[PDB]
Design a protein around this ligand. Structure first.
Ligand SMILES: *[C@@H]1O[C@H](CO[C@H]2O[C@@H](C)[C@@H](O)[C@@H](O)[C@@H]2O)[C@@H](O[C@@H]2O[C@H](CO)[C@@H](O[C@@H]3O[C@H](CO[C@H]4O[C@H](CO)[C@@H](O)[C@H](O)[C@@H]4O)[C@@H](O)[C@H](O[C@@H]4O[C@H](CO)[C@@H](O)[C@H](O)[C@@H]4O)[C@@H]3O)[C@H](O)[C@H]2NC(C)=O)[C@H](O)[C@H]1NC(C)=O
Ligand SMILES: *[C@@H]1O[C@H](CO[C@H]2O[C@@H](C)[C@@H](O)[C@@H](O)[C@@H]2O)[C@@H](O[C@@H]2O[C@H](CO)[C@@H](O[C@@H]3O[C@H](CO[C@H]4O[C@H](CO)[C@@H](O)[C@H](O)[C@@H]4O)[C@@H](O)[C@H](O[C@@H]4O[C@H](CO)[C@@H](O)[C@H](O)[C@@H]4O)[C@@H]3O)[C@H](O)[C@H]2NC(C)=O)[C@H](O)[C@H]1NC(C)=O
Ligand SMILES: *[C@@H]1O[C@H](CO[C@H]2O[C@@H](C)[C@@H](O)[C@@H](O)[C@@H]2O)[C@@H](O[C@@H]2O[C@H](CO)[C@@H](O[C@@H]3O[C@H](CO[C@H]4O[C@H](CO)[C@@H](O)[C@H](O)[C@@H]4O)[C@@H](O)[C@H](O[C@@H]4O[C@H](CO)[C@@H](O)[C@H](O)[C@@H]4O)[C@@H]3O)[C@H](O)[C@H]2NC(C)=O)[C@H](O)[C@H]1NC(C)=O
Ligand SMILES: CC(=O)N[C@@H]1[C@@H](O)[C@H](O[C@@H]2O[C@H](CO)[C@H](O)[C@H](O[C@]3(C(=O)O)C[C@H](O)[C@@H](NC(C)=O)[C@H]([C@H](O)[C@H](O)CO)O3)[C@H]2O)[C@@H](CO)O[C@H]1O
Ligand SMILES: CC(=O)N[C@@H]1[C@@H](O)[C@H](O[C@@H]2O[C@H](CO)[C@H](O)[C@H](O[C@]3(C(=O)O)C[C@H](O)[C@@H](NC(C)=O)[C@H]([C@H](O)[C@H](O)CO)O3)[C@H]2O)[C@@H](CO)O[C@H]1O
Ligand SMILES: CC(=O)N[C@@H]1[C@@H](O)[C@H](O[C@@H]2O[C@H](CO)[C@H](O)[C@H](O[C@]3(C(=O)O)C[C@H](O)[C@@H](NC(C)=O)[C@H]([C@H](O)[C@H](O)CO)O3)[C@H]2O)[C@@H](CO)O[C@H]1O
Ligand SMILES: *[C@@H]1O[C@H](CO)[C@@H](O)[C@H](O)[C@H]1NC(C)=O
Ligand SMILES: *[C@@H]1O[C@H](CO)[C@@H](O)[C@H](O)[C@H]1NC(C)=O
Ligand SMILES: *[C@@H]1O[C@H](CO)[C@@H](O)[C@H](O)[C@H]1NC(C)=O
Ligand SMILES: *[C@@H]1O[C@H](CO)[C@@H](O)[C@H](O)[C@H]1NC(C)=O
Ligand SMILES: *[C@@H]1O[C@H](CO)[C@@H](O)[C@H](O)[C@H]1NC(C)=O
Ligand SMILES: *[C@@H]1O[C@H](CO)[C@@H](O)[C@H](O)[C@H]1NC(C)=O
Lengths: 167, 324, 324, 167, 324, 167
């Protein structure tokens, strides 16, 4: 994918993370588990929802009555209507199909971005207090208990507190 | 072992696939189709005014009162007209209807419609008004005719020149219908009407018509080589229509008060009414108009999604999900 | 304290908002609307040929010279025609104009236009040419008539058969107009024209016309049950038009040399001329054609932006900017 | 945003940087201030300008004369014109609205990219001679005077010169 | 020196340029044009049924058998008709063809076509059938006429009233053609037909026609002020066409069995046949229909790419490549 | 470009890499040369090929017969046809031109992404066993022979094996 995270350096998704789109898995001496990142998940849901609603809502719909009201000696006018009807069908068909292909690309890459952005937020907090393994995981040079893990997830990790233990 | 924190994303049991511009058949955690493919299989009211459903009759047979048609039940308004593809009851007596397609278009959507008597059948004192019948227009095993017009013939070997007016005293436009009979030859001409050379003149504030019967040797249709040709006008409030004729005149008895506030069209459908309401009707059923696109049928009436040639338009909502 | 360098981006006092596919109402540092919403409130020249502005007259009244119309001021070329929605001066004498809409379309854009006399009113030696008037066509408190055609009547109880030709010796096509009078009955017929059974034949290299008056009992319009019906043709250079009639003939006096080099249409507008120039005219005012889209009016003439149903199309130029 | 910089790890914009879209703020013992990155700003201006001009200029405009020239017994043809006119209005309306929504997304993400790219250029120059704070700023392990700051901004920062002081 | 590994990308000698939404004239390693700009310069079969190529004849001249046209070579099916812009051989005798454009549309694509004799020229025992000729319709330096119809005139100073039928015993629709002659005056009328007041009646199960000659003083075209006006109908299997006339009748000799299974149109082209096959024909040559867009010509027949006003549509495939 | 690699921190392309779109150049005591990354190249080829084929294949084409069948007294209907024909030409022209401009942007940025992603894969393997120079190259702190170079290219570089030599 465009941002290199989903099915990229983060090779697969997590069945065990049921309560959000993006988040964290931790393991320490106390145990392990998954925590959704609520803020990034909600922003993403709002974003994709807005996209779908725009695709739907921006359509101008108006009353039309489509029949076949020309007779046997009005075939030239009947053909003019055919060319018109077929023309609009060709336009809407192409534009609908391509819109779907193009927007699906954007949506999947949007998720990819969101994961990468979350990854980078953690990376910059931990700096050299943890090893970047290359698979979406960080391996701490210090013990990081449940409260420490939460500080990482909530963006308040205190680097100076652990650097001595880390080095 | 050293402690770890990892960043990751949701997966689930979804096998839903989408296509992207660069990759086909991508499995995702959630998707949404934006193509409407379903219909209710019924003809419905349109917002929510009922259609006029003509069953086995054409618009012409219905208006003229073809006796093989169902009894005239008043429907004072409608949103669209439904005809079967090939109505069995049209002009029982063979012939033509002038500017027929324009009349159908005009009548496709009607705000008020009311049949009224404009020339009583009993008022023809100098002509025969009750012998205007044909085996081609049966009613209850008896020869009959279009019920809303009168086929006048000579009385006691004389057809006096007719001069009749009707003045539209109503507050609404009046649709008026009349006809001319084209006989097979001069012997039939004088047999029915006495006078060998005839005309029908019709004048309003805008109409200036003079019809004359055309003799041709014509093929028998339902055993008849004669023809009826029908005409119509919209008579405005306070205008008068004036008829003059010395033969071949198919006179109005009934006409129709109309109020027009917009148009639609004639739908060809073999379905019956379904006591439902819709915003978008197709000939095979009514559809929702929530989705932006549909693929049901092109001949729609109403506020419809855009018609496309596609079997699916599926948007990704969720993320790439490992497939089965 | 240790030294720092930081990377960052511009902000400003802008409160301008745009919408994106994933987010509504995003405040940005600079934006640009691509929808044209403004017009100048005037009718203008189109590149830069002036329109023909008919004021209170229809095309028919103008061409035929309805005397209630303004005096014929020559305008030798125009880019489009402007009529009011319901012109008060049309056919002063009630009637019809054959193929009227096609004629209007033909005349919508004209490169050269010049009225010429083709049959002098003084050349009718065997008919009365100065009694062809009606109270329905007043000029200066006197009964009059369409000024470009002549209503001929009998002279000394005789209407000799007319045989007149005009040969187009000009280098341009000629628009020729004539008419027929449909009287109310046979007594009026012979009173005006002597001859009870009449015709008008008109031939060119392509035209083969024979008109006959139609009697109908017609409603009074401006007190008159009679009708005038007008006809036209384009007479090519070196072709001749030949008229024959023994009554009911509304003869040409004047015709129009025309040069045609493209088409436009008839604009319905209640505005007057504004001595301006434009590339795109609408009925409520002229517009620029720099922007790709506009929302002013659908009935435009010229090279216009694409008409959309939208109140704003605002592109982001600058960056996300914190809102107020 | 897609690239994580604007309203991302760089949390807000700078009112004080008036002369460009993207750039640098420095603080040292001599003082502080803002400097526009002229090259990235100009490239961005050219890019967005080209996009707007393309949206405008690629429109094919031709002369048309739109009126209502059919009479009372030509209503079927009048309806054919209505279906045509309404059809094109529906097409242009949808395509105009979506074009605007989609291109605005691209434009904002383009700015985001440009900021991120500028950030990364500086990051790779400084390497471990400065601490990456996580908010778009770098904190030097050596004194960096005005001439040193300019070398960073102009891409000629000499890492080997300061590494001894830094360590 | 220390060892290094570097990441990089392909470059080549390409000077191909593309445009992007943000940058013009970007050099890339590989590109692909999606606009079709080429045609083969020939008229071809369409899937793969040959067109009917009329050379120097109009559809009317071909159908009626204008003798200045090429001999009738049977072509039993075709996909479209090709006329030159201004065919030299049309109606050799001046006149008109009723509903001509609709007939051309009907005949544009034909599944089966076969000329048959319906009224032998030798069967006119009471009229003269071999003097119906004009110097305006030469055949081999002799005066002649349209070969598929017969101009009947009086025999021994009498024109008995004609009464002829033809019954369509074939399994296919029959295109039937006839005409009327409009003379210059009453002296010519009686000279040709004896009877001063004449008609032609034509009846089928649907047709009810009565034609009468119109006298007008008409301009000479090819030295002739007279006119021929032609008419047509489609006679269904088992219907009969009945003619009655006492003058001015241009009678059928030959008619055409037709099977219709779809429509196309008339292409105007000055090219000849090229013994090729195509899916999309234009008047300047046939084109491939692999590309999504083309810019060759708007007046195409077939399954064509979408017509655009563009000189190039070049997609990038490869990567940014340093230019020359 | 959007991802900052192509004509970015990797300043130019390689004429000498003939057998792929993206890849590696190595230099060590044994010599030097170019190696295509086959997997990323093939995925990219499939991706761009799919895009072009979609643009082509999603077009609905149907039989139409376009002529001029109205006569001299049917000019109003002839104009209705003109407005229709011109309308569709304006629609297809604009949509074709913009599709090309927009998709070309996407294609070039897709290549940029692919290069960046490949770069990052190598970066995360090498970590502090090599210096990140900033121009797409890594300078090893240990000898990396041909087999070592291949382990980098095939994603199996063994960091713990060299860290002692590196430090
Ligand atoms: C369709 O019908 C309309 C309504 O007709 C009404 O009036 C009579 C004709 C009756 O049939 C009645 O039952 C109808 O309800 C027609 O409009 C009418 O047209 C006639 C002309 O034919 C007019 O008749 C004249 O009326 C005036 C008086 O006018 C004033 O009074 C009336 C009543 O208050 C008002 O309505 C008017 O606006 C005026 O203020 C008479 O003085 C006039 O004199 C006689 O003329 C006749 C010959 O015409 C002679 O026999 C006598 O000797 C007198 O000289 C005459 O009676 C109506 O006023 C008029 N009514 C309207 C418009 O409301 C309409 O013409 C018709 N349409 C057609 C034919 O197309
Ligand atoms: C509309 O008007 C066109 C121009 O008419 C001019 O010619 C006269 C008729 C005058 O009215 C004059 O004032 C006009 O300017 C018509 O074209 C003309 O049509 C007539 C046929 O009716 C022709 O007349 C014949 O001309 C020849 C001579 O032709 C040669 O000389 C002239 C002059 O140099 C050239 O123009 C020609 O090209 C030739 O080289 C005479 O010999 C001929 O003989 C007489 O015939 C008449 C009966 O027809 C008898 O009375 C006599 O005894 C002779 O036998 C005759 O005079 C014109 O030549 C022709 N001029 C053109 C085309 O320029 C046009 O027909 C008309 N349109 C209609 C009716 O639809
Ligand atoms: C076009 O042509 C159709 C076919 O015409 C055939 O029949 C003859 C008319 C011959 O010309 C023959 O060569 C043709 O092939 C016309 O259809 C036919 O129309 C006529 C009416 O004019 C009918 O004639 C009647 O036939 C019945 C018998 O009908 C039965 O037998 C036949 C033969 O097996 C079957 O085809 C039928 O379906 C029936 O089972 C006679 O009893 C009838 O009696 C006479 O009437 C005439 C006057 O009408 C008197 O002279 C006699 O005294 C008798 O009373 C009469 O002969 C044909 O049956 C009918 N055939 C069909 C439909 O196949 C068609 O009408 C015509 N089209 C037109 C005019 O528009
Ligand atoms: C072929 C043959 O043996 N005979 C036909 C014969 O059918 C035809 O006469 C008409 O025949 C039909 C049946 O096919 C009807 O019986 C016609 O009768 C009526 C009708 O029902 O229509 C009777 C009716 O009372 C009449 N009504 C009036 C108001 O007069 C009408 C009316 O006269 C006609 O419809 C007017 O066109 O007819 C019967 O006339 C004759 C026709 O000339 O031709 C034989 O060859
Ligand atoms: C209802 C009633 O009391 N009387 C009508 C009566 O109005 C009508 O006669 C016509 O009446 C109108 C006014 O409504 C005019 O006065 C008509 O006169 C003129 C005209 O102005 O048009 C006079 C003119 O000199 C005549 N011109 C010529 C060339 O002859 C014309 C002309 O004859 C007619 O317009 C031709 O149709 O008329 C006046 O005739 C009569 C009509 O029969 O009906 C009464 O019931
Ligand atoms: C201007 C002048 O000097 N004389 C014209 C004179 O041309 C015209 O008569 C007609 O002249 C043309 C040549 O221009 C032909 O010669 C006409 O002859 C034919 C014809 O070829 O068409 C002969 C043919 O045998 C006739 N066929 C039949 C079946 O009768 C036809 C036929 O009568 C007419 O075409 C019917 O309209 O004519 C010749 O008649 C006369 C016409 O009145 O006018 C002079 O002024
Ligand atoms: C897939 O998961 C959903 C959500 O838990 C569950 O409801 C559904 O039954 C599952 N499908 C299976 C078990 O096939
Ligand atoms: C995508 O899925 C459908 C099966 O529903 C299949 O027909 C099509 O070939 C598939 N394409 C690819 C590239 O797998
Ligand atoms: C916003 O800033 C601009 C540019 O300096 C300035 O001209 C304008 O007056 C400002 N708006 C205010 C102060 O409301
Ligand atoms: C966006 O702005 C307008 C106010 O002009 C408001 O009506 C609309 O609801 C806003 N939408 C959101 C999501 O804030
Ligand atoms: C460009 O390179 C190609 C591929 O090797 C080669 O075939 C072609 O001849 C080259 N163009 C030149 C040398 O101009
Ligand atoms: C792009 O290329 C063409 C030369 O073929 C030139 O006319 C056009 O001006 C160029 N535009 C730019 C911005 O270089």
């Amino acid at each position: 994918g465009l941002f290199g995270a989903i099915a990229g350096f983060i090779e697969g998704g997590w069945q065990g993370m049921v309560d959000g789109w993006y988040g964290y898995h931790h393991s320490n001496e106390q145990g392990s588990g998954y925590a959704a990142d609520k803020e990034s998940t909600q922003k993403a849901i709002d974003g994709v929802t807005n996209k779908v609603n725009s695709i739907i809502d921006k359509m101008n719909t108006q009353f039309e009555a489509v029949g076949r009201e020309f007779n046997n000696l009005e075939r030239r006018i009947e053909n003019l209507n055919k060319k018109m009807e077929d023309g609009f069908l060709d336009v809407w068909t192409y534009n609908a199909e391509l819109l779907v292909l193009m927007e699906n690309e954007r949506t999947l890459d949007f998720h990819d971005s969101n994961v990468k952005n979350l990854y980078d937020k953690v990376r910059l907090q931990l700096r050299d207090n943890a090893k970047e393994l290359g698979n979406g995981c960080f391996e701490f040079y210090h013990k990081c208990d449940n409260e420490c893990m939460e500080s990482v997830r909530n963006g308040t990790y205190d680097y100076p507190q652990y650097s001595e233990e880390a080095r | 072992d050293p402690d770890q924190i990892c960043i990751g994303y949701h997966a689930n049991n979804s096998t839903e696939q989408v296509d992207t511009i660069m990759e086909k058949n991508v499995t995702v955690t959630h998707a949404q189709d934006i193509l409407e493919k379903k219909h209710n299989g019924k003809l419905c009211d349109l917002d929510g005014v009922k259609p006029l459903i003509l069953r086995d009759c054409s618009v012409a047979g219905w208006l003229l009162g073809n006796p093989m048609c169902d009894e005239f039940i008043n429907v004072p308004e409608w949103s669209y007209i439904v005809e079967k593809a090939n109505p069995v009851n049209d002009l029982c007596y063979p012939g033509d209807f002038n500017d027929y397609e324009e009349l159908k278009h005009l009548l496709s959507r009607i705000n008020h419609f009311e049949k009224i008597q404009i020339i009583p059948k009993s008022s023809w004192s100098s002509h025969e008004a009750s012998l205007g019948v044909s085996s081609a227009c049966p009613y209850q095993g008896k020869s009959s005719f279009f019920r809303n017009v009168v086929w006048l013939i000579k009385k006691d070997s004389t057809y006096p020149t007719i001069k009749r007016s009707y003045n539209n005293t109503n507050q609404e436009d009046l649709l008026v219908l009349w006809g001319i009979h084209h006989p097979n030859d001069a012997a039939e001409q004088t047999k029915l009407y006495q006078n060998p050379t005839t005309y029908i003149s019709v004048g309003t504030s805008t109409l200036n018509q003079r019809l004359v019967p055309r003799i041709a040797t014509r093929s028998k249709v339902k055993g008849l080589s004669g023809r009826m040709e029908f005409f119509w006008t919209i008579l405005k409030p306070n205008d008068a229509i004036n008829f003059e004729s010395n033969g071949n005149f198919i006179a109005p008895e009934y006409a129709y008060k109309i109020v027009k506030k917009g148009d639609s069209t004639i739908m060809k459908s073999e379905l019956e009414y379904g006591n439902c309401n819709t915003k978008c009707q197709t000939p095979m059923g009514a559809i929702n108009s929530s989705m932006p696109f549909h693929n049901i049928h092109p001949l729609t009436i109403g506020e419809c999604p855009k018609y496309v040639k596609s079997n699916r338009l599926v948007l990704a909502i969720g993320l790439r999900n490992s497939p089965q």
